[PDB]
Amino acid sequence: TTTADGKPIVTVLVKKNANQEKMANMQWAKDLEADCDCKIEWQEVTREAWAQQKNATLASGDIADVNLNGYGAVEAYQYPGMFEDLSKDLDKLPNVKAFFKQKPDAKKMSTDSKGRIYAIADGRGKAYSGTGQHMLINKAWLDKLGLQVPTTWDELENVLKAFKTQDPNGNGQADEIPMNIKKLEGSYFTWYSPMLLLNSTGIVTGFNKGVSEYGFYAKNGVVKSFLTSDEYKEVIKYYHKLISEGLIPAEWATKDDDAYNADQISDGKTAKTGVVFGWSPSDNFGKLKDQYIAMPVPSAPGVSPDQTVWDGSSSELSPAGLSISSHAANKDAALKLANLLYSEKYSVQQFLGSFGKAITKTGEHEYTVDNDKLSQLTGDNQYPGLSELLVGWIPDEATIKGDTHADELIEVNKVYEEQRSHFDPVKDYIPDYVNMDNMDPSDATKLNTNNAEIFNTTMQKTATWMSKGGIDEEWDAYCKQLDSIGLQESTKIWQKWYDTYTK
Ligand SMILES: [Mg+2]
Numbered sequence: 001t002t003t004a005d006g007k008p009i010v011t012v013l014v015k016k017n018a019n020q021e022k023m024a025n026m027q028w029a030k031d032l033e034a035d036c037d038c039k040i041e042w043q044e045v046t047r048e049a050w051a052q053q054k055n056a057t058l059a060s061g062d063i064a065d066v067n068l069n070g071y072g073a074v075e076a077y078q079y080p081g082m083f084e085d086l087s088k089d090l091d092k093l094p095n096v097k098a099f100f101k102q103k104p105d106a107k108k109m110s111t112d113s114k115g116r117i118y119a120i121a122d123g124r125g126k127a128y129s130g131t132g133q134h135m136l137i138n139k140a141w142l143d144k145l146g147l148q149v150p151t152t153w154d155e156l157e158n159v160l161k162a163f164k165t166q167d168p169n170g171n172g173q174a175d176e177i178p179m180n181i182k183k184l185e186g187s188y189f190t191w192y193s194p195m196l197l198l199n200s201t202g203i204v205t206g207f208n209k210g211v212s213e214y215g216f217y218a219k220n221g222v223v224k225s226f227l228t229s230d231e232y233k234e235v236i237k238y239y240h241k242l243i244s245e246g247l248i249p250a251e252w253a254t255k256d257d258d259a260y261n262a263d264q265i266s267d268g269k270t271a272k273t274g275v276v277f278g279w280s281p282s283d284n285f286g287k288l289k290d291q292y293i294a295m296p297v298p299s300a301p302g303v304s305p306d307q308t309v310w311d312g313s314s315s316e317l318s319p320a321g322l323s324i325s326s327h328a329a330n331k332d333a334a335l336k337l338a339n340l341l342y343s344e345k346y347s348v349q350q351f352l353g354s355f356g357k358a359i360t361k362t363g364e365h366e367y368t369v370d371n372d373k374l375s376q377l378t379g380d381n382q383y384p385g386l387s388e389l390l391v392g393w394i395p396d397e398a399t400i401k402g403d404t405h406a407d408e409l410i411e412v413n414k415v416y417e418e419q420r421s422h423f424d425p426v427k428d429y430i431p432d433y434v435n436m437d438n439m440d441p442s443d444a445t446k447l448n449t450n451n452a453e454i455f456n457t458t459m460q461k462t463a464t465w466m467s468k469g470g471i472d473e474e475w476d477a478y479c480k481q482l483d484s485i486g487l488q489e490s491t492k493i494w495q496k497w498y499d500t501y502t503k
Pocket of ligand 1: 167169170172173174175
């Protein structure tokens with residue numbers, strides 16, 4: 001557990017994206033080792049490789065000293081005595097204390113109801129504080145056709161019929177896809193889900209992560225499932241009207257993500273798609289980006305602009321970034337390494353790569369990204385850091401120039417500030433620190449068991465209703481069936497955890 005020079009050896013498991021450079025080639029990782037005065041043995045695992053390797057490792061009983069995006073806190077309860085309770089070590093983690101002070105939601109994410117800290121959250125910076133979900137529309141097409149951004153479901157339908165029939169890309173072909181939507185996944189609502197139209201009805205979604213991807217929401221302090229809501233039924237009928245009218249592709253429900261995205265990107269010369277949910281004009285439309293803007297979501301019938309909401313997610317904080325083995329050979333070195341990961345120097349470098357590579361430090365808290373370089377490195381599968389898999393935090397005092405992914409986010413998020421102000425982030429949104437990873441293992445187990453029954457046929461039935469109709473007839477039996485297999489139990493369990501963390 002010790003070098004020849006007597007430096008402590010620290011094993012560190014680290015989850016990676018496939019497009020990333022190896023830890024051994026990252027200068028910041030060597031700097032970190034030198035600052036810690038230890039030897040780091042990196043164990044690099046991709047998102048997909050880890051999914052197979054994980055439970056085998058916990059069953060094994062043999063975990064790395066420091067673990068980056070390896071485990072969540074509930075696992076410390078599933079395998080007693082495996083993980084260090086970091087709440088007893090905060091004096092050795094001044095950078096973590098600083099993180100908790102500036103971002104109290106990260107403290108709450110990191111601390112369970114017993115006050116223990118088994119897995120510390122991470123943050124990507126205030127530039128990512130808004131939602132990752134947006135609704136994008138071809139503004140050039142609207143201009144060309146002499147139409148306004150629609151503000152109701154009826155106006156939206158009229159705009160889509162105009163996209164369908166008036167050839168707004170000018171090529172003479174009836175090739176326009178008025179609105180394109182992602183297929184449903186079997187077990188959760190996805191990023192950019194067509195169910196983002198729930199916000200039209202006054203129900204706040206949070207599809208970046210957490211509870212609302214299983215169909216839960218809150219209003220006035222009471223947790224509900226939208227799976228059995230009139231609102232969910234109205235969204236599905238509205239989609240059926242659109243699909244039935246040829247305004248969304250017939251084959252949407254079976255179309256793979258790659259083909260779906262290629263629809264929007266087209267050939268980079270002729271725009272094909274009028275409306276999608278997505279990140280940004282640039283991310284979703286590439287070279288065609290100048291034709292597109294983000295729009296506020298249209299209101300559903302009976303729903304006032306004041307009552308119309310937008311997705312309540314934040315892209316900044318992420319739970320379960322850092323965990324430390326209770327059996328760490330060199331515990332003090334482990335803590336020293338973890339504290340350094342949460343310093344600005346190493347948090348920024350984890351995020352955007354080593355200084356001098358694709359990012360330069362221009363001041364004490366100021367950095368400039370060289371975008372050509374970052375894109376080239378990414379293309380070559382040599383991204384110089386951990387990017388969104390950073391375990392650390394970008395402090396508010398840091399100003400980063402040239403993070404295009406952040407800059408585009410900032411611009412589209414301006415569009416949603418009004419609608420997002422229309423809900424209470426506590427009473428009308430189940431906060432991100434209320435998640436299955438912050439519960440008793442017995443409660444998590446119930447929720448997972450129920451989820452397998454709830455999402456046995458729900459997405460399939462939802463897709464079929466959207467495509468083929470028939471919801472009115474089948475709705476009552478569908479709801480009773482969901483309630484009979486544990487939906488109301490799940491709702492009650494989420495209510496309890498919501499109240500524990502919130503009330
Ligand atoms: Mg055309």
